[PDB]
Design a protein around this ligand. Structure first.
Ligand SMILES: [Zn+2]
Ligand SMILES: [Zn+2]
Ligand SMILES: [Zn+2]
Ligand SMILES: [Zn+2]
Lengths: 108, 76, 319, 81
């Protein structure tokens, strides 16, 4: 896998490493939590522990988000990966009206 | 009730009878007491017939009536 | 000004009930062979089936969708005194899996409906014995658990129920239940129950005295920010009623709110027992279907008067 | 002026806004217009034009805006929303 990575091929490295018996350790450091859309409490998960509802809702489709997502660290808004990609393909303002130029405040 | 004995084409074990304005249904496998009794009509009944093209449908017509009463026995 | 066309969909048995999703891209159909089918519309605009299975031992009467915010959830009522909840799981061929079943009814479950989205994930079931049961799922992430929240006795054979789609902060939840009893006595057939926050219990608010014929369908219209509520009743003649709440005195807040009932339209063009009534999204067009094999579309006019706007036939031949 | 304004408010014609202005009376007139017509898009757009904060604080205007947003969502016009 290290040789493959040195060669510049990355996908093959992941494919090979998927066959390792020993799993690695999780990242110890900064993590992301989401404010519940109902109780506004700090919930570490896709489902609330108090309101038992979905905590993360897309800023475009307004549907519950369970898989891959993107958000602006400066503005705190985000949603579905494909939806936000389509939105930022042409537009440059935060789609929730916050006024943040999330591209310039996120692409560090 | 001994008048208008008839058997449902779809359910060979179901029979019907009517006396005056009261109608009863019987199950030949356990025909000791009527399985069910329909609501008694004021006017005496005149005809009772099962629908051959529809399962568990019975039709009744009474004396001097312009309306025919249909019953759906397909619940059980 | 309505034109019709035939959708190239193949069905082998008689279709009992059809229902749309929220976005109008998914359809659910119940057949006469205790079968349920799901159809999806492609980008080109064609419809293709995606799932099919048998659900209950008795006949299947009604099947309805839930709001997409809770996922893809369907609720089906059966003549076998059961009400099943189905959720779609895909791993991509769709694989619908039943998640829960309510069999608390002692008679055949006649109708099943979903509560409005702003009130959570609730469901209502009206049975033939005169019992309306309202259940709620405390956790939206666990579909297999449900609790019976409310139970109401109507003393008459329930035939149809309808929620109030109002989502305002000043309107308490409302549910209307009809009846199809054909007793010779002249009795009311429509009653309305309004939830009371002070008691956490639903209480009867108003009974439609003017309705004595058996009722087959009842439908609230979308609120859309109006100041009153619109109800449609299906009988030997289609009826439209308007309910306007009265100003509640600030001296004391008591029981159910008083309302003023006025009829605004009564059509008898079907000349038969009207079977189904439905509203559009905006609550401005009413669709009615009766025993005459015809579909009638009614709309208001410049003088705020109700008149027929479309007539069609079951075969699709225009009139 | 008073009589004509009262008549227009009880009538529901948008032309009476010139008399009432963007105040509570204008809100009542818009409510009557919606009751007759059901158009929420026009009411939403008009109520946003330089209306004072207290005027914008009414529940009815917020409800109309939310209904318009929900309708737009039900049409997949997300970018418009
Ligand atoms: Zn919560
Ligand atoms: Zn931002
Ligand atoms: Zn933002
Ligand atoms: Zn999204």
């Amino acid at each position: 896998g290290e040789i493959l990575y040195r060669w510049g091929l990355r996908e093959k490295r992941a494919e090979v490493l998927k066959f390792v018996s020993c799993p690695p350790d999780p990242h110890k450091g900064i993590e992301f939590g989401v404010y519940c859309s109902h109780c506004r409490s700090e919930v570490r998960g896709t489902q609330c522990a108090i309101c038992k509802g979905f905590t993360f809702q897309c800023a475009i489709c307004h549907v519950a988000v369970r898989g891959s997502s993107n958000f602006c660290l400066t503005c705190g808004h985000g949603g579905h990966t494909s939806h936000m990609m389509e939105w930022f393909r042409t537009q440059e303002v935060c789609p929730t009206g916050c006024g943040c130029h999330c591209l310039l405040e996120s692409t560090f | 009730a001994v008048q208008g004995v008839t058997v449902d084409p779809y359910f060979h074990d179901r029979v019907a009878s009517f006396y005056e304005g009261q109608v009863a249904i019987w199950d030949l496998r356990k025909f000791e007491k009527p399985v069910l009794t329909l609501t008694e009509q004021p006017k005496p009944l005149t005809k009772v017939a099962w629908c051959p093209t529809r399962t568990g449908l019975l039709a009744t017509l009474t004396r001097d009536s312009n309306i025919i009463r249909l019953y759906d026995m397909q619940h059980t | 000004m309505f034109v019709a066309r035939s959708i190239a969909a193949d069905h082998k048995d008689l279709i009992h009930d059809v229902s749309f999703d929220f976005h109008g891209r998914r359809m659910a159909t119940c057949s006469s062979d205790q079968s349920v089918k799901v159809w999806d519309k492609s980008e080109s605009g064609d419809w293709h089936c995606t799932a099919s299975w048998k659900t209950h031992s008795g006949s299947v009467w009604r099947v309805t969708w839930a709001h997409p915010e809770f996922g893809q959830v369907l609720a089906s009522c059966s003549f076998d005194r059961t009400a099943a909840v189905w959720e779609e799981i895909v791993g991509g061929q769709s694989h619908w899996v039943k998640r829960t079943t309510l069999v608390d009814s002692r008679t055949s479950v006649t109708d099943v409906k979903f509560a409005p989205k702003h009130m959570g994930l609730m469901l209502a079931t009206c049975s033939a014995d005169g019992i309306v049961r309202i259940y709620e799922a405390p956790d939206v992430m666990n579909l297999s658990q449900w609790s019976l929240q409310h139970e109401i006795s109507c003393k008459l054979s329930c035939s149809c129920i309808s929620w109030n789609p109002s989502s305002s902060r000043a309107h308490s939840p409302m549910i209307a239940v009809g009846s199809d009893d054909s007793s010779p006595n002249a009795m009311a057939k429509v009653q309305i129950f309004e939830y009371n926050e002070n008691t956490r219990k639903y209480a009867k608010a108003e009974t439609l005295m003017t309705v004595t014929d058996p009722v087959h369908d009842i439908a609230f219209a979308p609120n859309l920010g109006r100041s009153f509520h619109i109800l449609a009743i299906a009988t030997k003649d289609v009826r439209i009623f308007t309910l306007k709440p009265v100003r509640k005195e600030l001296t004391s807040s008591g029981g159910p709110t008083k309302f003023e009932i006025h009829i605004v339209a009564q059509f008898d063009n079907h000349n038969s027992q009207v079977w189904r009534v439905s509203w559009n999204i905006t609550g401005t067009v009413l669709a009615s279907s009766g025993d005459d094999g015809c579909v009638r579309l009614w709309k208001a006019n410049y003088m705020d008067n109700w008149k027929c706007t479309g007539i069609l036939k079951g075969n699709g031949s225009p009139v | 002026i008073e009589k004509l304004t009262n008549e227009m408010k009880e009538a529901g014609n948008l032309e009476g806004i010139l008399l009432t202005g963007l105040t509570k009376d204008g809100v009542d007139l818009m409510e009557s217009y919606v009751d007759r017509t059901g158009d929420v898009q026009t009411a939403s757009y008009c109520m946003l034009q330089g209306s004072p904060l207290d005027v914008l604080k009414d529940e009815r205007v917020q409800y109309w805006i939310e209904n318009y947003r929900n309708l737009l969502d039900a049409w997949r016009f997300w970018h418009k929303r």
